[PDB]
Subunit: 334 residues, 6 copies
């Protein structure tokens, strides 16, 4: 019955490559959700169990959408898709979160326990608190009370169809671009003088992972609105072997996409993995993750894919001297 956090992590290792910290974070969170679904509760009465809902910090290309989609594809439970900034203004908040619960209950086929097994994914979260509007940004308290409780009622058409928010997993995600600012600056780093040189810390993960709600309070988010999502997941930073594996391993492996795209015209596309390692190095210079990885891929194959309807070219090899360097097309071979 209850899917184990090691199972969810290992199956999400087929779909999302790397990102193990957030993968353990969601595995634990939904494991506790499905414990709190299947038990009476995973602690006795007169203890409110924690909401076990996650706020995530995610760079570009870093699979954030593929993550939340592939959790619905792995668990096969109901799923909710939205973004935070579409919900920001007053006058419609308590009406439209009934439409996302209607999408949850439709993806549950109106089941109570399956809609409790539902997932809510909200993107864009770092772009609501645009400032550090008294009828403007209304999210923080309303969505706080919605996640506290909306059972059998209109939240704090379809008045009653919605389901327990204490058992749905809420994942919310955003980019939070002052990451190397407020964290390092809490360790003094912006300063003309040196703080303490132990603020080197020698692992870059220390600058990602020792985030605290102070950083989001500097981003103008209110810490109580952070507190209702007790889990903070930081994605791993991009690296060229992670890029090679995100290109080559997963269900949407872009090399296989373009390989079968050229195979629609029965022209073979070969590759040199060292070229893929240097193109991953240029995507690390692009700072765009897997989204810019394919942008460099198409920047190479543009002319040859343009001519592939007409060319008699037997195979094309994407190689360092055609991808990472040079302005000829990928190497014509037999």
């Amino acid at each position: 019955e209850v899917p184990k956090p090691q199972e969810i992590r290992h199956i999400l290792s087929d779909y999302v490559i790397g990102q193990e910290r957030a993968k353990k974070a969601l595995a634990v969170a939904v494991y506790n959700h499905y414990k709190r679904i299947n038990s009476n509760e995973t602690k006795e009465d007169e203890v409110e169990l924690s909401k076990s809902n996650i706020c995530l910090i995610g760079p570009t290309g870093s699979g954030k959408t593929l993550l939340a989609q592939t959790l619905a594809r792995i668990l096969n439970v109901p799923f909710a898709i939205a973004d935070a900034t579409s919900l920001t203004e007053a006058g419609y908040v308590g009406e439209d979160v009934e439409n996302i619960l209607l999408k949850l209950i439709q993806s549950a086929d109106y089941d109570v326990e399956k809609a409790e097994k539902g997932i809510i994914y909200i993107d864009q979260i770092d772009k609501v608190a645009r400032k550090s509007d008294v009828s403007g940004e209304g999210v923080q308290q309303a969505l706080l009370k919605i996640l506290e409780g909306t059972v059998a009622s209109v939240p704090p058409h379809q008045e009653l169809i919605q389901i327990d928010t204490g058992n749905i997993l809420f994942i919310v995600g955003g980019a939070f671009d002052g990451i190397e600012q407020i964290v390092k600056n809490r360790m003094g780093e912006k300063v003309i003088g040196f703080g303490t040189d132990n603020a080197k810390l020698k692992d870059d993960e220390t600058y990602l992972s020792r985030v605290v709600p102070e950083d989001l309070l500097k981003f103008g988010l209110i810490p109580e609105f952070i507190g209702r999502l007790p889990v903070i997941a930081t994605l791993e930073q991009l690296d060229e072997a992670a890029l090679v594996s995100i290109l080559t391993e997963p269900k949407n492996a872009l090399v296989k996409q373009y390989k079968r795209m050229l195979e629609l015209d029965d022209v073979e596309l070969e590759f040199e993995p060292t070229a893929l390692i240097e193109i991953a190095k240029e995507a690390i210079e692009r700072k765009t993750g897997a989204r810019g990885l394919r942008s460099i891929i198409e920047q190479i194959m543009l002319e040859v894919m343009f001519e592939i309807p007409s060319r008699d070219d037997i195979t094309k090899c994407i190689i360092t001297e055609k991808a990472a360097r040079g302005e000829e097309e990928p190497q014509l071979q037999l």
Copy 2:
């Protein structure tokens, strides 16, 4: 008899350890108001009709909402809740007053004495009032009293973690910095400054004084601290080491925390300013790899060592 302020402050000091000022003031307000309702409403010989309502002032993550909630769970009195941000929106003012008043009356079982002894929590006053604001009269006319039980003898709470508490008393006492020749022996950061607070500081928070006339009781919560938080982690019924231990124990493994490591945990929570909700988050930062591995572990007693709370993300030793 009407529940005593002392036994209220006692059982709420079971739920939230510390902040005895706020318990003593709310307990006197509610005992006085419930004794006024149990007497009738208020008596003759020109005893004017007291409001006896409280505003809850203090830093974030103190369980201050949880305190009035747990008091409603102790007294089993009607509890109402709403948020004054939509009360700032016209029309919906009396509609959210109706949502408050139906939630109080159906939780009273339509009894006029228990809805007169009702509790009405209001929240996020910090999110509207700055200093205009669309509530300072349209809610004033409800707090004086209206039928739509009449509101003029229900108990009300306006709770919130108002950011004026680091602004305003830091203006009066906080600029007493230099101390060359120590005339301002009162320059103690938090401790005298929160016990300085006067309702004019609440005018400087964004109120109007006639709403202070609706609020005879203006308690501030005492400063949160790591020893009262360590007490909150284990001693209340809803304790957090207790629920995490039961969550791991239903995964067939027992969890233990050293109290030195709990002292380090609550000291990190105080330094990172999250309060009580951040406690479960720090515990989760520690327990993440534990709950992740435990369905595939043979460990029986996961003792969290003080070095694990010193690093905040380190796994305990394994014995089997």
Copy 3:
């Protein structure tokens, strides 16, 4: 006919202690105002009628809101109390203050002659009008209330509705010192006037308000000036002991609900009056300091059957134990 000015200030002295200047000013203002209401327009050839609009100078806590409310309650006329900052959002100010004209109207039972005899009280003009030359169009909208806003959109004609506007006016203590002293650095016998805050406040000239930042075009329709007078610790103990529902009489009645006689020593009241003038709380922080005193009394009161709870100056100034139990 019209309430006489001596009658006005003598009945106002039963509700507010002192303020004899403000009481004489309001007595002349109500007298001219109700003579303008009742006389059928002052001079028969349709001259400009007596404005009688009141601008008022008075410190924090000073019962000026009580003066306006009680002057309205002794003549059986409405009041409409307003806060300048609560009603100012933009130039679109009329929609906020006409709700307070609706607070006059809802207090007049919709009648027009009781709305004319009624008074609008608008509180703390000096905090909003400050010179910040290191909002004049809302002042012209408020000037149209004294020029006379009529049934049409910015209604009973507010030129014939009485009007009070009140402020603390701190900086005028310097600008009156400028006239009185010939400026504030001062040497030799400049004390011929440089000698007390009442020697300053008794001579306050309203043009100094204009130099403090006010607009003369607005004050041109405010003939009446109600200067309040400096309250003090004996007037504080009078605010405890004189008024009919005074605050310690309310506390005595609150502990009389417990059948415990909460007795107050007047030496504790004079000690608290020195502390609230030192802490600067006006009359309003007294109530809170007494609540700081008998919090623990009410805390123990379900379980304690003390006969007299006497509040004595050792318990009042230190608060280390309850006020004394008499067994």
Copy 4:
């Protein structure tokens, strides 16, 4: 139809004391404006005529707003009174000036013929003369639109005249252009301020083109405040003595005591605004006791105008 400018000025002269050059200019402007409107604006070719819009220069306290009320009460035509001080924004605030024009439609009782006959007065214009000028933008757009048939008056205080009149003779530093050149001087130059001197104050020249007429108030004086105290229907001496004479005691206002009081109002820089207050600073003692005073009369003498502190001199 409408009366002539001469008699319109004569009726304006009971309420507003003096200010007469501006009274001539507005009286001919409104007469031409309502001649244009009522005689069918231009029979020949239906071609345009001027709209006679007037810009007013005067001091504070100068009856400017009383003059606007007096013209609106005289000519049986609607008006709007407005001020541009807090309308100093770009974009949206010129719709709030069109909402000032909606106050003219409330005032014109929703009639198009009275809206064409409607008069707009704008006060404190020189606060925008720092060149958001979206008030200078608005009078351009509303003169075209049939909003071009409306009559506009705008008034201001304009302190910058002193630089311009000190310029406007021996303009620069050589001996040539001397104290014998371009003979007019720094006070007829308040009346003959040319549109180019309005450009030298701080105003848009197309917006200056939107004001065909320039007019000037009389800069107030002591005996002008004595006539404002005594002559018009707004005369303070009439209401102050009549509020006393309703209690059957008369206040003899001595005219040299009114001279020392108008000296106090002029010394206070406040103009006729201060006068209501100043008489009350003296008369607070009078109205305090006059039901109980059985004096046959009281009088304000020079000593009581010099003091403003004691009771005025009683007769028994």
Copy 5:
């Protein structure tokens, strides 16, 4: 039918005088607009013709709004007037960027063909941007300036008579950029200071870049009409010549009270000279005449004079009463 630009410019010469290059340019626009509507494109298979919307530059107060109203008069077509300074902040008041064509269409009575012959006139554009001051208007307008033919973003605005007028005060700053960047001399030596009337007619689109414009926003207004400076001959031929002659306006207004105002031609040229000192356009001409006629209509209740004479000492000075004819 298609009216020729010659007699269009000749009947336009009855209400505004001078500006004749711009009068030919807008009459050419009329000719070409009627030619691209009534043959709804002239190229074979009706492939897209040049739409040639008009941008008009030169001195303020020069009658150009009266030119656009005179064009609306002469062709009798739909007319609407937009303003740049009234749409800048989007979502506060920047939403009537389509309601100007709705006002044209309501005043076209929802027509398609005479609304294609309709006029969009625009003003205040030179005062709203600098290259966000008021630059938002360029994007606000450009979506309709590109011009939907019949699709709803409906009248082809590239068949509409499209005119964008203004004062454009900064051109002398450009000629001091171009000629004035020869600054000190010391080689080439300010030789282009041969002329100064050149300065407006040598406008270049990169000047409008420096004046605050998008180049596509200049580009969808390809035809630049440049005005002519009103001189004293233009001023007397606006005072006395046209249908709207100011001395005929004041003579009609005084003649409602049966007063003729005789003006001397030496008084007329002195009014013209003093208005060229004012620089206030032809709309400042009447603003001198009012300083003279003040006494006359005010005293005509008192005086029976059948006519009154204005001489140079009433014109140049304007500080003495006009001459009686008893």
Copy 6:
């Protein structure tokens, strides 16, 4: 099956002059979006491709309206036009870019397979990029985010269509870019450094504009994560401009010809006169727009006199082109 990118590019070149590498790039995205509908998936378990939508950066005047029309003329495809500034307002307006998707479902006449083939043009994307409620204070920026992330089979009004089959022509006017991306090297500004004007830049930077340069211009880099296909324009060229004057069926020399032919005037254009006009249009920096400004500056009094001119034809020599100062020479 669906048209090959080469024939679309060749026919799009017979109207739209220059911009060759951009025409190749859009035609490749067209062929991706067409083939991923027709050969409806390429991988196992029917995994689909990336969004592959194309973002067009470069000068104005590059004829984008003509390609936007001509692509629907070639491909027989539903089309839609969007403006990034049109739905900028937040709260209740930013959603109505869905009315442009509902306009693409008018050009399909409600057909799901044809609006799945359907194509949406977007303009003025540069005008929104702002790196108060300032940055992304528009709703439109994050509405386009959400739909280019893909909404597959749900409403956020019938069922919306996944944008991994719908192609977006995401263009803007893009003036203020070149100096900033040049500054990526060009920060050899007052400082000298690494051979300091060794660059042969202009195109060599404008063809290698990295997404961080668009972030410097002010866009969200995650928004560029939705736009992997970065298109660079060819800049304004005079031989391109005289080919706009001669090749496409909207040729402006032919527009003026057929305009003046109704007045019994053939206006003859010399090719070097078109060269001088094209050079002055490059110095006007508007692409083929200011071309019309120049030629109508020549033709102004020529057209004004034309109803009265009895001249059968008039020819424009370079003395007319480079100076404006004369009538085109009359042949009777």
